[PDB]
Amino acid sequence: SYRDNPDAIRALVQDDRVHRDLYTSQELFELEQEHFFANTWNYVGHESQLPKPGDWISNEIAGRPLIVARHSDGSVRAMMNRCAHKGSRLVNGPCGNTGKFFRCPYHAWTFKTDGSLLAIPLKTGYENTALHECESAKGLTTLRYVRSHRGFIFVKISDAGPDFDDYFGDSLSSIDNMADRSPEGELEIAGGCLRFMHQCNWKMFVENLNDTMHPMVAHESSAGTAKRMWADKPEDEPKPMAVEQFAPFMSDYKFFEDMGIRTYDNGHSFTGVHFSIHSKYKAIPAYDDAMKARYGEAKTAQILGMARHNTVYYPNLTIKGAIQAIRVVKPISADRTLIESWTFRLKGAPPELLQRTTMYNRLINSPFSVVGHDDLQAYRGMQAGLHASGNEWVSLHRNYDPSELKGGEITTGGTNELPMRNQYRAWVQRMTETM
Amino acid sequence: SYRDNPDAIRALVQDDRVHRDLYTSQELFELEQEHFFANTWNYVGHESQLPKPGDWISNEIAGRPLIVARHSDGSVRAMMNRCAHKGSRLVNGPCGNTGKFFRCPYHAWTFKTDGSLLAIPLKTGYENTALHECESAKGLTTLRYVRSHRGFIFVKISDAGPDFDDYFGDSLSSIDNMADRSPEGELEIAGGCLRFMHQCNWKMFVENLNDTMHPMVAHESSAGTAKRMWADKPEDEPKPMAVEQFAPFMSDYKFFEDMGIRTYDNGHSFTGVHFSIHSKYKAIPAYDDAMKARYGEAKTAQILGMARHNTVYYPNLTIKGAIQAIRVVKPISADRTLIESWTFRLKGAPPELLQRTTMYNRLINSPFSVVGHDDLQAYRGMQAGLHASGNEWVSLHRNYDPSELKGGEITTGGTNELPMRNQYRAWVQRMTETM
Amino acid sequence: SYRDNPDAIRALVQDDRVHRDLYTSQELFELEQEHFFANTWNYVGHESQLPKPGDWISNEIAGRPLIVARHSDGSVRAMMNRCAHKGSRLVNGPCGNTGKFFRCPYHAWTFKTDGSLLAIPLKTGYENTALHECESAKGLTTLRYVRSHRGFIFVKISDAGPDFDDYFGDSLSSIDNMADRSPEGELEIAGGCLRFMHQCNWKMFVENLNDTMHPMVAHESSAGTAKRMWADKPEDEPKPMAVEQFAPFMSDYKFFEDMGIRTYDNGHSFTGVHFSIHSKYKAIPAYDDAMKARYGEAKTAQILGMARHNTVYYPNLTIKGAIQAIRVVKPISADRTLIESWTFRLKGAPPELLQRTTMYNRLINSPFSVVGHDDLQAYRGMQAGLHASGNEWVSLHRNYDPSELKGGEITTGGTNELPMRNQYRAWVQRMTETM
Amino acid sequence: VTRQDLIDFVVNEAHLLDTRRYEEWNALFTDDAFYWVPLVPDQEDGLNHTSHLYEDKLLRELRIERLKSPRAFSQQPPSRCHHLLQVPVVEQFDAEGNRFVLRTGFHYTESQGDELQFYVGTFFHHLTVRDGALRMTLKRVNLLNCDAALPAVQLFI
Amino acid sequence: VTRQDLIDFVVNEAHLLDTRRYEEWNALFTDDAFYWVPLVPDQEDGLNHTSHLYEDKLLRELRIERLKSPRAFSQQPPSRCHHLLQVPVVEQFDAEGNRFVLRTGFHYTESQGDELQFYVGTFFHHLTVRDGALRMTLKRVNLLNCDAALPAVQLFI
Amino acid sequence: VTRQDLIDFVVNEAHLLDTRRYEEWNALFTDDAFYWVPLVPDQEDGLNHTSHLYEDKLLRELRIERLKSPRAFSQQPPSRCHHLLQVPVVEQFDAEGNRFVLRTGFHYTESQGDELQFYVGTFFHHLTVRDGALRMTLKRVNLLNCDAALPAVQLFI
Ligand SMILES: O=C(O)Cc1c[nH]c2ccccc12
Ligand SMILES: O=C(O)Cc1c[nH]c2ccccc12
Ligand SMILES: O=C(O)Cc1c[nH]c2ccccc12
Ligand code: FES
Ligand code: FES
Ligand code: FES
Ligand SMILES: [Fe+3]
Ligand SMILES: [Fe+3]
Ligand SMILES: [Fe+3]
């Protein structure tokens, strides 16, 4: 009973705790799909996936199918994957190329790549009718909120909410670093996509990203096993990259506390302001030489000294800086979510960078990964246990202070539970703005 | 939010367009199962399926299980498949024969074939009770709207709506032709039943029957392929019946426009008033000789010159005249439908007629059929695409003229979209009559 | 439309009949899970499943996960299987041993076996917060309605309803007999558990237990087949225990009528006050010798002459006296139920008793059992047929008399339909008490 | 006598079960043989522990005869079954001792009406020679999910 | 010529179907051969009774050629199929009469996008020798649930 | 040395995986061998492209050792697996060159608690002889729906 009940929507979130209905209620999920995901900027793809004119990809955002295409003038356009005649899809598949126009596979209506109508077969049947007055004459319904930053494309279905610039603020710097680690300053999509289905609400996955108290407990059986296996080895023998990427998970509390956290407005936040778990990662001389040749000394040192752990763009994107890997959240139901992990190739860099990126992606994000197994087990346990009665709340009291209610850019320690509180404040705002 | 809200039910249909909720809304499907399918005549079977006394078939109409049986006096009766004691089914399976009475398999209550109570075991336990005052004393609940035309059995669950004669009007002539193509004037069920599950609303399938704009577009990859494969052969070589039945799908617009369409009241309509796609189909001399011997030259010429393309009896039956094949619509949910295709044998005809009928049934209606694949892909595309926002309507403006609002028998061109509009007018009336 | 509608809840039950919505309505199932199963005592296990300190089992009652554990002082405690931090489960699996404390597998919060909080890692992060004021400071939520009788553990989630003693009355004697058939007076769990999924409401299974009208009709194809297969053999040859256990199902009407029935308050009732189908079951001399050595002639004769057919503790437990087997009802949905069958070993008895018990359990309660097949087919038929219109009631008129409305302990014939009426009266009361 | 005979025996038994020739299938057993479906993994025996099926000759005859009855309400319409077998592996082969043990992976499918279920597991076959004919002394059926919740299984696996 | 050759023929035909080599698969048939999928159990023939598939050479060529079209809207993205076979059993073997019959249990899986379906049943193969090459004269596919409600099946089984 | 030896090697490896004898299974690999699960069909290599699993000796040892831990929270209760194999087919047989390639269709089932999933695909085996013992140099597992959305797979396929 939340429909048309904004006060009961606000009542599920308090200053330092939340209600269980945020993770289980299906009607809340439907209300989100109608309201929350239509009022925020969402990652739909990268510009390198549609380089040529007429190239298109298909996505699904907030229960809507979308075509993101490259118009003939070189721009990027977004439209509904729904024909103007009776609703049939125009393009079937994840990606493709339609040449100069879209042609419906039902009655062969034709539209331009920007969505405008081109031709209706046997038009002589519409002379004395009212087709030209309705909205089927305009063509496909378009989205006028499409923006690109360093190739990343963000869309916003509705017209309610802050614009791109004020929505993202200064978090975009993370993306810039991801793009500045290439001698050419460009990224391309390569290496394939890993798709993982979680039997849990998307919210828990979004919270696990900036939780520094979990890795030494849940991920003990694997990271600790690796740490013990590499123990007793000579300190001079090179560490296999698997051990290098697994060891930091079992660090002490002081390491994560000093590692640091920064939060922005609108639920965007990155972890690891001073250093991170990606700080050591050996060193490649040829890549450093290339970046030296392109940028210089000071600029190269500044770029490669920026080692953020991971960044969260609310509500569906997370990225890593020094690994060049992103994860996208695809909510399905109240207890079903799909996670897609992509990798990038830096233009002009030696292959070792992409090899390391693919190895990390396989080790961490694959459905066959042990770390993913442990995290999914934690999510499933939370989903099953949140049906008990009595205590009907979830605590977010760690490192809480009311002075955080002023907002803005806030820097703090690594074990703070501030990011979740900011996320839920933003979620409440985005729900209640359109009630 | 349509329950007890009839004006919002009327608001989903306009003069020349409809809303998307007619194809997706599950609550609308439940309301239909409660209201629409209980207020219309529905095909439940043929008399040749239950020839002997005591023979029964079991059907499922509007969420109700039904037994259609042959009483001892030779008539046809319909009753609920629900025992009077506690609700258990009396007969399990698609068809059978119970002899003289029905016997419940739970506590062995017994009822007559017409549904009236016969005996209750250990009756001595009901002397001072109130069983004889309730409705369990009358036996099974019966249906008093059961009618038969040339063997076809139609039932109507409720008492609201026009009677059989006014409901069907003069469309029954189609059935007569189907039965007049036999020297004995009788049909029998033979050849088996094809069952095909569509992941789409039943409405889309019902529309695809009288849509002459689709076949040259959606069915191109198969019908056009067959046409090109044959095109090359000498014009004297006999055409295989597969090519004969496949070629007419890829005709030009003028052919389908000149084929013609006739519509009746209550959503019943047939396509191909003068000449159709089944018009050539070679010729069989023995069958013509038999019909000449039975009827004469004039009557045989009149009967065999009637070649309607297909006929729609709303809301669940469609038939073909010269092919002797029917299709039945079995709605399951908002996005799930079951289609059953039967074939008939004409009594006294040579086997070539049934061979041709079975060939056509396999080629068109099987789940392994390419034409079915294309049509199902179109339905699935429509179902997926009708969830997009913006334009929330489905256009039915083709060949629209307000003078059609007077109703009655209307004859028009082949590409008119009148039948869909008549269907939805009837659907609105049938829902709103009992809200 | 039953939510907050107590009068419409009462209107589905009359004096001698019930409505169909009690077996199909999903909203009614959810209301039950919120109200009915939270206001009655339910069987969660036996004390022999958790003998040592720290031993725990996990159960699922009324949509809640529960841990039933043995505290360090030897008592039995029940708590929610939900961590106080964010809701993750503490123990995964059906049973186990946690040592001295529970440790959450997400962030390693720790609680005592009785549920109280023990330690929070990195506590220095909660000094100036409000964690100590909330309910997460107390630890796990506990249940203070936990009771044990001869090892059987019963819980009651809420505080509304009669207490254990008044809830069960004098039906507990049945349990005592089940425990008095052991020379040591103790039972243990042995032989495994049979789990059977029924595509029917739990109510039908609960009704089938005290229905003496059905066995000679539904179970005819198996019990009658066995009776006819044995009928031929000399009367001196020993009957195989399969035939011994199968023959009584096909008795005449007078046998079941004279077998007898007794009913208590709150839906508890047992069948077979005078004799039962387990009356003959051959005889074991060593078991009788041991019982005589422990109790004496008179007490042994009294104990072994008490042979109730089966006992029903509403709403989820049924037991058999002379067979030492119980069945538990686990509702899943409106049309899905899970049935678990356990067996007991009597302490100090020869192995023949357990061999006979396991044979009966396999023959009757297995998913591979023919008797189970017939009963499940009856349930499925009832579930399918209760969707028909017209007669929308289920008759419970057999042997009905208004003088039974005074309540209390009532003894009557074997074919009376009183137990179902008492069950539904109690069900109505338990729903309406908390409305 | 030869291994290939044992593989052929197992394959032919599965085929006999598939084509509803129960009268011929039941004749392959010895008079004191058992058809065992354990309930727990590594179950010790079927006497002191519960099982899904522990059938001697009498119970097998009862089950086969019940299928021919016109009042087997749960078998209307009749069910159908299919066996897909991996090649049998002969573990123990005692030519002098007259005792053979075979292990076979199986995928079993059962369909009735519009409902279909499948199971996977292992068959253990104990075979001997009686009067020159190969005959079974025990057929053990190890299911992968024996202790999980199951629906009704109405035919021989 | 030898039994193992027939077993290899069946296995290789399944493999050819698995790797989308339709042009080579269709060449194994005789000119008048048929690819038959019955609709009911124990169906008599495909002439006077309806079937799911009763294809001669022309219809097989049509189905193979349609897959290469850029407008096969139902095949975007293309589907994938997998065959798992029990070892074929040679029922009849007429070396002099030039007639071979093989029976093979099969599990067939078809996947497209995020959708997957499976079926079980039996293949009956009629093989002959034409100019020293083994060739089919009829391929019958018996499904376990042939008369049940089915979804779209878009590839050769 | 002989083809039947390679068939038995593949069958016994599947059996070892089914019985949870991981210590014996891992000893069949060579020191530099790889256990590869490609992510896309016709993947070129596991170095420059992502895969589901590309395990050397160290990662296999880590995965095997984690299963014995008392804090492997995702493995409570432990999962069970079953392999059903078609007869292996020897494609390449280089007796002199010491390199053998085998292709095997498979149906793999994994169950935990009341949950069960299955997959179908093909095994490619590269085998060599080290000191008279057959040993694996690469095990490639081609899944039919490798690029589809999958749930957690917690055991060796
Ligand atoms: O980024 C990763 O590799 C996984 C991950 C998600 N949240 C974390 C918090 C602390 C340490 C690692 C992770
Ligand atoms: O009857 C058929 O063969 C299929 C069919 C349904 N609607 C049609 C419209 C035009 C041409 C063919 C069809
Ligand atoms: O107890 C049993 O073995 C089964 C059973 C349940 N209700 C009955 C009623 C009469 C006879 C037997 C049973
Ligand atoms: S639905 Fe697109 S042309 Fe008709
Ligand atoms: S339900 Fe039919 S006799 Fe009782
Ligand atoms: S959820 Fe249990 S410690 Fe956090
Ligand atoms: Fe994690
Ligand atoms: Fe069509
Ligand atoms: Fe019963």
Numbering used by the authors:
A (entry chain G), B (entry chain B), C (entry chain D): 3 to 282, 283B, 284 to 437
D (entry chain E), E (entry chain A), F (entry chain H): 6 to 162
Paper passage:
The Rieske non-heme iron dioxygenases, typically composed of α and β subunits that are equivalent to IadD and IadE, respectively, share a conserved α3β3 configuration. IadD features a Rieske domain (residues 44–160) and a catalytic domain (residues 1–43 and 161–437).
To understand the binding of IAA with IadD, we then determined a 2.6 Å cryo-EM structure of IadD/E complexed with IAA. An overall mushroom-shaped heterohexamer composed of 3 IadE at the “stem” and 3 IadD in the “cap” was resolved. The active site of IadD is located at the interface of IadD subunits, composed of a Rieske [2Fe-2S] cluster from the Rieske domain and a mononuclear iron in the catalytic domain of a neighboring subunit. The [2Fe-2S] is stabilized by contacts with Cys85, His87, Cys106, and His109 and the mononuclear iron coordinates with His216, His221, and Asp377. Adjacent to the mononuclear iron is the IAA-binding pocket lined by polar and hydrophobic residues including Asn210, Leu211, His216, His221, Phe251, His311, Lys322, Arg329, and Tyr362. No profound overall conformational changes were observed for IadD/E after binding of IAA. The side chain of His311 in IadD is relocated to accommodate the binding of IAA. The mononuclear iron and the coordinating residues also move slightly inwards (about 1.6 Å) following the binding of IAA. As anticipated, mutation of residues in the pocket abrogated IAA binding.
